Write a protein that binds this ligand. Structure first.
Ligand SMILES: [Ca+2]
Ligand SMILES: [Ca+2]
Ligand SMILES: [Ca+2]
Length: 321
């Protein structure tokens, strides 16, 4: 655990970054180092010294690629941007003409272009999806899965063998990852959710989608994993806009979160007006028959019908004063 990061052969800044990935989301050193490998591939592919790209574009690409594990399809391409603009293979499309066409690269092929081996790419994708599904603390140990949903258990087991090549150790692995990714059931930030939120905010062309009736999703849904992801997206993007890279801003932010008190909520309320947040959620969730000025009535309505959004409001209200 501690023993893994002594030798390495990473800058002090990179080790700090790896440790934040591990602490905040639950990744072990193996997965965290694979995420660092992706980032290093982006710097080799999109230079600011030998080419034209910027650090913010490289940070966007990292968020966009990690997000695509869980958020894909044309609805997300229009929203967070098309990865095919940056990752493709060209093939002769008409043998007589010589005309070529650019064929979009799959997510696993993007991972390998950026430096991961085929096995590393499969492991990274799997662990990013696991963290995404487990972060909210709604999933079960294999021991409870067997009894409750035996078909989900054998499905999950098959996915693990697909990745690692064996069924051996699935129960121990799943239970170990469930404790780490879910923060022992209490909730960690949903990393792919945070990533696609940040990618969307950095696309040249979050909490609001999760707290309102937007079309696409399951209505409002803001479990603890999305609460942290949504607020941390806004906070870290804000630090980046002030001049920091993603690695610097997230390192400074998670350090500050540890050193302070309710820093996640206080910093969110400095980026987003508490009254605008309240108003956005009220207009979307509260029917016109309820006087929105009668704040005690509204809070009891939300508390009864949207317990997750209620906690979201209670936590911010608490720090708004
Ligand atoms: Ca989530
Ligand atoms: Ca402000
Ligand atoms: Ca209801």
């Amino acid at each position: 655990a501690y023993a893994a990061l002594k030798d390495l052969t990473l800058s002090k800044q990179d080790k700090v970054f790896l440790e934040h990935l591990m602490t905040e989301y639950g990744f072990d050193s193996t997965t965290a180092r694979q995420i660092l490998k992706l980032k290093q591939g982006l710097e080799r592919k999109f230079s600011s010294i030998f080419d034209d790209y910027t650090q913010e574009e490289r940070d966007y690409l990292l968020f966009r690629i990690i997000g695509s594990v869980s958020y894909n399809g044309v609805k997300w391409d229009e929203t967070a941007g098309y990865l095919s603009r940056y990752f493709y293979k060209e093939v002769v499309s008409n043998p007589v003409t010589g005309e070529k066409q650019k064929v979009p690269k799959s997510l696993l092929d993007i991972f390998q272009e950026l430096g991961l081996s085929k096995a590393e790419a499969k492991q990274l994708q799997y662990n990013l999806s696991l963290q995404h599904e487990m972060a909210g603390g709604t999933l079960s140990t294999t021991g409870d899965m067997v009894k409750q949903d035996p078909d989900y258990y054998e499905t999950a087991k098959n996915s693990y063998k697909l990745v690692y090549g064996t069924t051996e150790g699935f129960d121990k692995f799943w239970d170990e990852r469930l404790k780490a990714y879910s923060n022992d059931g209490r909730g960690n930030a949903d990393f792919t959710h945070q990533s696609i939120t940040m990618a969307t905010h950095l696309n040249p062309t979050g909490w609001e989608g999760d707290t309102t009736y937007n079309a696409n999703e399951r209505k409002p849904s803001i479990g603890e994993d999305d609460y942290k992801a949504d607020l941390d997206s806004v906070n870290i993007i804000g630090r980046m806009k002030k001049g920091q890279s993603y690695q610097s801003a997230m390192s400074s932010y998670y350090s500050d979160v540890q050193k302070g008190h309710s820093v996640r909520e206080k910093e969110f309320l400095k980026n987003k007006d508490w009254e605008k947040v309240k108003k956005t959620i009220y207009d979307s969730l509260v029917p016109n028959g309820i006087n929105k000025n009668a704040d005690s009535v509204v809070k009891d309505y939300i508390a009864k019908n949207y317990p997750d959004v209620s906690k979201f409001l209670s936590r911010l209200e608490s720090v708004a004063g």
